[PDB]
């Protein structure tokens, strides 16, 4: 699988990323902090986000060292955002095992250590990007709160939400790899486009595969729902209004929702949009050097839609 | 003292206010500045950004980046407050409802995160990696001090050294960062940077000890409006730690009951205050606070004899004015 070949190809660099994470997560006087952090990185992830920073830098010819610092920074930011989102992966969250108190404060420690780590690079431009990505994640989550169970939510808004909470960190991760590696700006832009597109595809694929039924029960406005609402008639408008905007769900509803999406072609529409975004990601890669990592990133983008091809 | 210093820094503080309003804005999530507005327009003496401005101008800096740094210090403080209120799930701040009450915990968490991020984004405009590393570290140290405060609470083994670590992390670290970065941005000699750091560290320590003292009615041990929160939360602060260290077997059982077990009943705050008074621990905490202002004042001696140096000297008096005898 592509994430496995990536991990093999980046093995040396990931050992250093792991060591930097260990070094910066430390706390002499609050063990809770690395304790809480150990769990979360010890129990979760293909670690795609730090790997994308490393791969992007190596792909544009950079031999190190500061792509490792940025990859660790990216992973700390991802981890911090997860801790705050929970106030997981079929295991007790930190907020339940300790308290909301712990999710919040450990996340804060990680966010700060990530920013402190980024300064070692001396590169103002990557630091501006990663600070912005963190801001955008927080803003996207606030907008998701705002627009929740709201039928006026458009595709455009959904795209902004998903870029917010998922795509912005992927696009930042890849972009700062190109920048730290000194890539020409066409290639920096392409790397940003690749990560952005990959992040969107991942999220759309998750939302398609749900329809299992957890997003429905949560009354989530994900893409196939949004497409089905816009095309709703008089009766279909009432069915969405009831089960999404009012939460009154009964047996048969999930199947009816799936029946309406199929009727309006919006599950296939969502699936092809996801494929579409993987195509857009792969297209951006054609601007990058012909390096074995480029093929691995091409494969990774294909892999995103492997279950739905 | 707060107001003289404020009037001398009026123009810079206007520029700080402006950058804050500009960077707390959100094009996609209006709740963010609504929530931020609601914390900043709820009073606050704004000592922390003043400390940065004063330090930079004291070493002869003409701008512009002391404004950026002062705004960042305030963003960090504001984010810290928003998160401290989710953590102990507080209903009021400065007599008005908290962001988390008015909205929800997730909002106060996410707004604090937004401001924290924007503040680091802003710092990159300065091009100075050193001050960025300092302010990042201080942010980490704040979070760490807050986690330490949690493990220290309910725990009678907490020592004065641990307490000093908690307050240094939670409170002093940002005061010391604030002054230090002002010296650095102004290109001051490293001995002046260190003196500004030491000034800020001592003042911040004094500042927290004064709050902890006033929480138990001050030297006189008098019950009023702003007393009893630390006792209810079973925090191990100086006046408690000192009384616990002097406790005989029966007194220790009282402290065990009300602090460790948390079985607090009517009259128990006043009983605690009576033990503090018997053991001289409120006066002792007063002395610790005024001692730290001595240390702060001594640190100033290495700085140039500028009107701002004298105003920082008066500010040290001001921080302990409420416990003067």
């Amino acid at each position: 699988k592509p994430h496995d070949r990536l991990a093999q190809a980046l093995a040396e660099d990931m050992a250093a990323v792991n060591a930097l994470i260990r070094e910066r997560m430390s706390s002499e006087h609050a063990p809770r902090i690395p304790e809480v952090t150990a769990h979360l990185i010890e129990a979760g992830g293909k670690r795609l986000r730090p790997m994308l920073t490393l791969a992007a830098a190596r792909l544009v010819g950079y031999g190190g060292p500061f792509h490792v610092h940025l990859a660790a920074t990216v992973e700390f930011i991802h981890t911090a955002t997860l801790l705050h989102d929970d106030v997981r992966r079929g295991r007790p969250t930190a907020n339940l095992l300790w308290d909301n108190k712990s999710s919040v404060l450990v996340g804060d420690y990680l966010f700060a250590r990530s920013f402190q780590l980024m300064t070692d690079t001396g590169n103002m431009r990557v630091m501006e990007i990663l600070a912005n990505a963190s801001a955008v994640i927080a803003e996207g989550e606030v907008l998701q709160l705002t627009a929740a169970q709201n039928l006026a939510t458009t595709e455009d808004i959904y795209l902004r939400v998903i870029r917010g909470k998922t795509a912005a960190l992927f696009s930042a991760a890849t972009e700062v790899g190109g920048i730290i590696g000194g890539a020409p700006e066409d290639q920096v832009q392409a790397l940003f486009d690749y990560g952005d597109a990959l992040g969107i595809a991942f999220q759309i694929v998750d939302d398609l595969l749900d329809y299992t039924g957890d997003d429905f029960r949560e009354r989530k406005l994900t893409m196939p729902v949004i497409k089905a609402v816009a095309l709703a008639d008089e009766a279909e408008r009432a069915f969405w209004k009831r089960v999404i905007e009012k939460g009154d769900q009964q047996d048969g509803d999930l199947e009816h929702a799936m029946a309406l999406m199929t009727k309006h072609g919006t599950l296939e529409a969502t699936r092809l949009a996801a494929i579409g975004w993987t195509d857009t990601a792969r297209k951006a890669l054609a601007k990058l050097p012909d390096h074995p990592l480029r093929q691995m990133l091409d494969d990774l983008a294909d892999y995103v839609v492997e279950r739905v091809r």
Side-chain angles (χ1 to χ4, degrees), chain A residues 1-27 29-41 43-88 90 92-95 97-98 100-148 150-217 219-233 235-236 238-245 247-305 307-309:
Chain A
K1 288 158 185 168
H3 56 98
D4 300 296
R5 290 192 324 276
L6 276 172
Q8 149 168 48
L10 306 163
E12 188 192 340
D13 279 350
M14 288 288 299
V17 167
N18 290 342
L20 275 181
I21 290 172
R22 182 185 175 75
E23 177 180 89
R24 300 319 178 95
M25 86 187 190
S26 268
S27 169
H29 293 289
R32 181 173 294 186
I33 295 178
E35 183 182 47
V36 175
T37 303
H39 255 223
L40 220 70
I41 296 159
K46 303 159 190 320
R47 332 255 326 253
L48 290 193
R49 295 167 183 78
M51 287 199 307
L52 284 171
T53 296
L54 300 170
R58 289 213 167 250
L59 173 55
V60 301
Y62 187 62
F66 296 112
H67 66 312
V68 168
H69 303 63
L70 297 173
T73 300
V74 163
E75 197 160 24
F76 278 134
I77 289 176
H78 175 57
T79 303
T81 61
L82 295 184
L83 287 160
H84 288 193
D85 202 29
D86 283 338
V87 325
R88 197 170 267 291
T93 57
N95 50 277
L97 202 27
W98 300 267
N100 266 175
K101 332 183 150 207
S102 77
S103 305
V104 175
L105 293 174
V106 173
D108 285 345
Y109 189 73
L110 297 178
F111 276 132
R113 292 299 191 206
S114 88
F115 290 176
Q116 166 191 37
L117 177 54
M118 236 170 51
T119 73
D120 287 354
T121 72
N123 184 298
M124 291 290 123
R125 180 178 175 193
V126 303
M127 293 185 232
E128 188 277 338
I129 285 162
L130 293 169
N132 179 79
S134 181
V136 165
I137 287 157
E139 179 187 65
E141 289 170 1
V142 172
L143 181 54
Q144 177 168 230
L145 286 189
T146 285
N150 176 358
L151 274 65
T153 297
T154 147
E155 285 204 27
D156 287 319
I157 287 359
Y158 170 79
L159 272 193
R160 288 188 195 284
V161 165
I162 64 180
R163 273 197 171 101
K165 80 190 191 172
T166 298
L169 189 55
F170 277 108
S171 58
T174 57
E175 192 186 19
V176 301
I179 295 170
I180 209 63
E185 294 301 328
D186 69 303
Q187 294 181 8
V188 167
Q189 180 66 47
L191 280 165
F192 174 93
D193 296 354
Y194 172 87
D196 176 64
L198 188 81
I200 291 172
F202 269 122
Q203 188 69 64
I204 294 172
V205 165
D206 286 345
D207 300 359
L208 174 71
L209 292 161
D210 174 283
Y211 286 102
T212 88
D214 292 325
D215 295 343
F216 184 68
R217 279 149 207 147
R219 315 147 40 150
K220 275 205 189 171
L221 279 282
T222 55
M223 222 207 345
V225 176
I226 296 176
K227 286 170 173 290
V229 173
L231 291 165
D233 69 340
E236 294 174 19
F239 169 86
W240 295 115
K241 195 187 179 58
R242 179 167 58 74
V243 306
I244 293 310
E245 215 199 12
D248 175 9
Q249 304 200 340
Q250 291 154 52
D251 311 334
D253 279 350
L254 159 35
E255 293 80 30
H256 193 74
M258 293 168 107
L260 290 181
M261 299 178 157
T262 296
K263 184 208 298 183
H264 293 301
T266 79
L267 283 161
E268 282 301 309
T270 301
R271 175 182 86 85
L272 292 178
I275 299 305
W277 282 103
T278 70
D279 293 335
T280 295
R282 295 169 77 180
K283 172 172 112 276
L285 288 173
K287 307 203 180 187
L288 302 180
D290 185 13
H291 179 285
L293 285 160
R294 193 178 72 180
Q295 186 69 50
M296 286 173 229
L297 293 180
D298 193 77
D299 294 334
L300 178 62
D302 208 7
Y303 167 81
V304 166
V305 290
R307 282 174 296 184
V308 303
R309 219 110 206 209

